[PDB]
Amino acid sequence: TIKEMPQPKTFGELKNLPLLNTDKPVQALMKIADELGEIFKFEAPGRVTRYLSSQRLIKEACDESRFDKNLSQALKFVRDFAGDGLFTSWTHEKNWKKAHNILLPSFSQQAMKGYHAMMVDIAVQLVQKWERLNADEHIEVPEDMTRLTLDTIGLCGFNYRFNSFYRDQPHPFITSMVRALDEAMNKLQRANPDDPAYDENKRQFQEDIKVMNDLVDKIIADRKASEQSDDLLTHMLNGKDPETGEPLDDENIRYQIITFLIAFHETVSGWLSFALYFLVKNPHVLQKAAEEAARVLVDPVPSYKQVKQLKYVGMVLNEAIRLWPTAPAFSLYAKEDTVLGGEYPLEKGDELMVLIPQLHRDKTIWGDDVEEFRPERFENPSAIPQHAFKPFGNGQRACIGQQMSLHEATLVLGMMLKHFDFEDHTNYELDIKETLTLKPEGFVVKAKSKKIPLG
Amino acid sequence: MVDIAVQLVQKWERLNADEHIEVPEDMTRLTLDTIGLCGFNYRFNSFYRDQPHPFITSMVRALDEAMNKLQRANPDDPAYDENKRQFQEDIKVMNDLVDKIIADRKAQSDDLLTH
Amino acid sequence: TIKEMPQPKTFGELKNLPLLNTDKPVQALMKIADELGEIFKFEAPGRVTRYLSSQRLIKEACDESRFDKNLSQALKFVRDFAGDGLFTSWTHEKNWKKAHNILLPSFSQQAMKGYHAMMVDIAVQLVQKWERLNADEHIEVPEDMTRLTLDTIGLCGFNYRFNSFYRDQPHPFITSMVRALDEAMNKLQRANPDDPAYDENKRQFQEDIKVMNDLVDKIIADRKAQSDDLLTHMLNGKDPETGEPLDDENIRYQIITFLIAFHETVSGWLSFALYFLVKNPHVLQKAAEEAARVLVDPVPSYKQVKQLKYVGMVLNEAIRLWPTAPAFSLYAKEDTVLGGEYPLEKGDELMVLIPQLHRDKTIWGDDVEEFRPERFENPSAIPQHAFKPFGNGQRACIGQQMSLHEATLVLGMMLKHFDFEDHTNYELDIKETLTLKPEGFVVKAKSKKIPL
C-alpha cells in the first residue's frame, strides 16, 4: 500500500527543472499533471515538492490540523517585494495574525456596503469609455480590466486616484509591478542564476521595486494630509491588534499596501477578462446573463442590493474562476509526519502544491463534461462537494478579499452586460499570459452600445 | 460642447492632492475634442490619452515647420532635407486621418460636416 | 602576469571613449591596432574591453572551453529591438539553444535547394531592373543590394514580398531598421544617456520598434491563415526537453534578427565584391569567364551555383578584407592567461577585430592588402582560426551557407549579364552602422544582351 510517487523526466543535478522552462509553467504543469495523474514529485535543485490534482488527495490536504500554509518558492520570491505582508507571511510569524485581525473587519459584508459607492465610480468610467469609442474601434479587454481593478482597489482601499482611464500607456507602477512578478516567475526556472545573462535582470528587479515603493510612500503621504475615512488604510494605520495592543510597524504597512494593490489588480483583472472570453464564446450563456442584467439593474446605477440579485452572473463568474483560477496554486507543508491518502508516507515539513486548475478538472467530482463551460453547475452551491472548488485558497489562510472580489466582478460584469452587446470580431484563440497569476493575452472585442444612460 | 467640458471638470476633480494641472495641454485636449465632436461627430478621446494624438502632433510639427521656413535664407540647402521629409510625412498623417473622419459618415446629424 | 597591456590616449574620467567619436568606429579601432599591435585595452566610462588582432591570440580566444560569446555593449543595445534573438542571446539563456537546434535544419545545405527558387525570383528582378536602364543612367550599388538582400530574405525565408524594386524611397520598415540600428551605434558615444537632449532620439527609437513589431507580429498571424519555410519551422518545430515550440514573442525576435542580419551583412558583402571587381579588371575577367562558362541555362540551377569556384573565391577574398560584421566579443569562462602574457579575471571581455585578424601579416603574407583571390585555391592550407569572418564555435554565424549561396548566385548572374565600369573612379568609403557597407558606390553596366 505504501506506494512510491511518480516523478517526470529528471536531468542531471538540475533535477526536473528543464521541464518547466517555459513562459507558461502552470499550463505546463497541467500538461504534466495530465500525464502523471493525481500526484507526482517535482524536484528542483535544492528543493522538493508534490503537486496534487485529485479532489481525493486535496480533501486530505485541506485538513488544517495536518497541513499548514507553506510559502512556495514562488512566494519566497514575491516576498522579495511583498515581504511579510498577508500573502507572503508564515501563518506563525508575528505580523501575520496581527495584521489578519486588524484588517479582517474591512472585508466582511458590513464593510462592503461602504465600498459599493466608489466601486460604481470606477465602473461608470469604464462604461463611459466604451460608450465614447468610435465605430470601428475595439476594446483591449485585459488592459481595460487592469485599468479598472487598479483604479478600484486604490480608491476603495486607499482613497488614491491612479486615473488609469486618463492614460494610454499602462500606469508606470503597473509596468514595474508586472515585471517584478514576471521576474519572480523567471527566477524559478533559472538554470544558473549566476552567469552574466541575469545581471540586467538584477538591475531591473531592484529598479522596479523602488518604483513601487515610491508611489506607496506617496499614498502614505497623501493621507498624512487628506478626512472621514473608513479604509483598508485607516485600519492599517490607526488599527490596533486587540491581543497585544500595538498597531502595525511602518515596514509591514508598506508590505500590506503593495500586497493589496497587487493581489486585487492581478486576480481580479484575470477573472473579469476570462469571464468575457467564455461569455463571448458561449452566446446563449451571454444571453442568459444579459437578461439578468437588464432585469435587475432597473435604476441608472446599481445599488449594493442589486448586486446580490445577479445570481447567474455569480454563476458565470464561478464557472470562469473554476476553469482558470487566476491564482492557480497554493502551497502547503506537513505539520508532522503523516501518510497522505493512505498511500504516500511523508516526513514532517514536506511541501504540497495544489494545482487548483487540475483539481477543478477532476472527473470523479465534476463529471466527464469538465472542460465545457456550463455556469449551471453552480446553482445549488451546497451540492458542490466539500474541498472540490478551491479558487480562493483554504482555511484561515483563504483569500481575505474573496467577497470583495465576487462583489467587484459581479457589479462590473453586470453593468457590462446591461450597457453593451459584445462581438468576438477577431475569432480570438485563447492565449493565457502567465506571470504568477493567469490572464488572457491580446483578447479583443467590439462592443455595441445599447445606449442606456448613466448617473 | 458641454460633454467635453464635463470631462475636463471630471478630470480635474479626480486629481489627487499633490498633483497639479498642465494648463495648455489640458486646454488643448479640450479644444480639439470639442471641435471634433461638434464639427464632425468624431471622438478624439484626448482625456483618455497621455501622449498626444498622432494627428495633433503632426499638426503641431507642420505648423512649426511653416514657421521655421520663415528664417531659412535658402530653403534648398541640404541641411533641411529631414525637415522636408517629415513635413510630407505629417501631411499624409493628417490627410489620411481626415478621410477616416469621412469614412464614418457615408459609411446623418445636424453638424458642421453635414453642411 | 608578465606583460602590461597597451592602452591608447586617455581623456580623464571619459577614459578612451572619445577615441571612437568618429562616424567610423571600427576603422578607428583598426588605426589603433595598427600602431599598438596584437592586443590593446580599450576603456569606456562603464566598461573595459580588450581588442585582439593577431591570429596567435585569437586561436586561444576561440577555445570554447575557456571563452563564450559575450554581448558587447553594441549587441546589448540591439537587444532592445532584437531582444532574445539568436544574435543577441546569451548561450546559457533559455531561448538560444532552444531556437538554435530548431533552426539549424533551415540553413543546412539540404535546405538551400528549396530556397534556391525564390532566391532566383528576386535575383531576376534585380537583373531586369538593370537591363531596363537607359544609357545615361548608373547603378547605385548598395541601394540595389539592399533591395535584393531584403526581398530575398523576406521572400525565401517567410514568403513575404517587400517589393523593394517597385519603390524608390526605401520601405518604412527598412528605413526604421536602419534608423534603429543607427541609434544603437549612436548610444555607444553617449556618456550621459539620461541627459534630456536624447529625448527625441529615445522617442523616435521607441516609435521605430513599434514599426517593426507591427509588420512582423502581423506576419506570424498572417500565416496561421503552412508551407515549408523558415517561418513554418518556427511555428511548427518542437524542443525535445520541454516539447514546446518557440514563444510567440521570441519568433518576433528571430524574424527581426534574420531580416536585419541578412539584409545588412549580405548587401554589404556583395557591394564590397563588386568594388574589388571593377578595381581589379583581370580578376573581373576571370570571374566573368567562369560565369559565362557555367551559367549555361536561362536560369541558374542549384548544382551550377556550387560549380562556381572563382566567384566563391572572390567572395571569400572580399569578406577577408572587409568583413561586413567586423567583430565579435567573448568573456572568460574562468580565470585564465591569454598568450601566456596577459592574465584574465573571470568575466573579462575580449573583442576580436576580424578585419585586423584578416590582416595579420605572419599568416597571409606581406600582400595582405592586395585583392588576390587565389589565396583561396587551397582552403585547407589556411590555418585553423586565421579566417573567422563568420565568428567562431557554436556561436558561429548560422546563415553562412545561405549567405554564400545568395552571394554566389547573384554575383554569378551579374557577371554573366553585364560588363561593369568604375565610371566615376570611386574611392572606397566605408559606412559604419554596426555592420560595414561602402557608401556612394556607383557603377555603369553595359548589357551583354542575354535573355533569362
Ligand code: FDE
Ligand atoms: C484583495 C484580494 C483579492 C483577492 C482575489 C482572489 C481571486 C480572484 C482568486 C484568489 C485567490 C487566492 N487568494 Fe486572494 N485576493 C485578495 C487577497 C488575498 C490575500 C491578502 C491573501 C493572503 C490571505 C491570508 O490569509 O493572508 C489571499 C490568498 C489567496 C490564495 C491562497 C494563497 C496561499 O498561498 O495559500 C488563493 C488561491 N488573497 N484571490
Ligand code: FDE
Ligand atoms: C540570416 C543570417 C545571414 C547572416 C550572414 C552573415 C554574414 C555575411 C557575415 C555574418 C556574420 C556573423 N554572423 Fe551571421 N547571418 C545570419 C545570421 C546570424 C544569426 C542568427 C547569428 C547568431 C547565431 C548565434 O551565434 O547564435 C549570426 C552570427 C554571426 C556572427 C557571430 C556573432 C557574434 O557576436 O559572435 C558573425 C561574425 N548570424 N553573418
